[PDB]
Amino acid sequence: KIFKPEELRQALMPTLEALYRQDPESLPFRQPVDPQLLGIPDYFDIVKNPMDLSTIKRKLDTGQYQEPWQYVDDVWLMFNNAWLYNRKTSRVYKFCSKLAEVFEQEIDPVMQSL
Ligand SMILES: CNC(=O)c1cc(Br)c[nH]1
């Protein structure tokens, strides 16, 4: 089974759009964390592989995922980064947990279809 880049994009894009639709919960995740701008120099000492929704979308728009599990890996990487860096009751952590719930509720039938 080989995937065509625009077909893979059409199949997965609704799952990414569902994350983007969440307001306010997608807001911390719509752009890359910039530790200098945010004044959190420790960020890249804990998060070695940053990921965010804008980067996932760009990868999905430019054929960077050959297989659907590569996309699923990047979504979970974004989540796991936030769950490692932030306090459990912080806004970012709580918002992350909402996005992961949305992602769970949705990604199963899409993967079954691929
Ligand atoms: C995904 N964003 C974060 O994990 C983050 C930004 C700031 Br400021 C603290 N945590």
UniProtKB/Swiss-Prot annotation:
Query: What's the effect of swapping residue 97 to I?
Result: Impairs interaction with ASF1A
Chain positions covered by the region annotation Interaction with histone: 42-88
Compartments reported by the entry? Cytoplasm; Nucleus
What is known about its processing and modification? Answer: Methylation of the KIX domain by CARM1 blocks association with CREB. This results in the blockade of CREB signaling, and in activation of apoptotic response. Sumoylation negatively regulates transcriptional activity via the recruitment of DAAX.
Q: What's the domain of life for this entry?
A: Eukaryota
Q: Where is this region: Interaction with ASF1A?
A: 80-98
Q: Please describe, based on the UniProt annotation, the reported consequence of changing residue 101 to R.
A: Abolishes interaction with ASF1A
Q: Which residues form the Bromo domain?
A: 3-110
Subunit structure, as described in the record: Found in a complex containing NCOA2; NCOA3; IKKA; IKKB and IKBKG. Probably part of a complex with HIF1A and EP300. Interacts with GATA1; the interaction results in acetylation and enhancement of transcriptional activity of GATA1. Interacts with MAF and ZCCHC12. Interacts with DAXX; the interaction is dependent on CBP sumoylation and results in suppression of the transcriptional activity via recruitment of HDAC2 to DAXX. Interacts with phosphorylated CREB1. Interacts with CITED4 (C-terminal region). Interacts (via the TAZ-type 1 domain) with HIF1A.
Q: Which disease is it linked to?
A: Chromosomal aberrations involving CREBBP may be a cause of acute myeloid leukemias. Translocation t(8;16)(p11;p13) with KAT6A; translocation t(11;16)(q23;p13.3) with KMT2A/MLL1; translocation t(10;16)(q22;p13) with KAT6B. KAT6A-CREBBP may induce leukemia by inhibiting RUNX1-mediated transcription. Rubinstein-Taybi syndrome 1: A disorder characterized by craniofacial abnormalities, postnatal growth deficiency, broad thumbs, broad big toes, intellectual disability and a propensity for development of malignancies.
The free-text domain note is:
The KIX domain mediates binding to HIV-1 Tat.
Q: What does this protein do?
A: Acetylates histones, giving a specific tag for transcriptional activation. Mediates acetylation of histone H3 at 'Lys-18' and 'Lys-27' (H3K18ac and H3K27ac, respectively). Also acetylates non-histone proteins, like DDX21, FBL, IRF2, MAFG, NCOA3, POLR1E/PAF53 and FOXO1. Binds specifically to phosphorylated CREB and enhances its transcriptional activity toward cAMP-responsive genes. Acts as a coactivator of ALX1. Acts as a circadian transcriptional coactivator which enhances the activity of the circadian transcriptional activators: NPAS2-BMAL1 and CLOCK-BMAL1 heterodimers.
Which named protein is this?
A: CREB-binding protein
Organismal lineage: Eukaryota, Metazoa, Chordata, Craniata, Vertebrata
Portion of the parent chain present? 1083 to 1196 of 2442
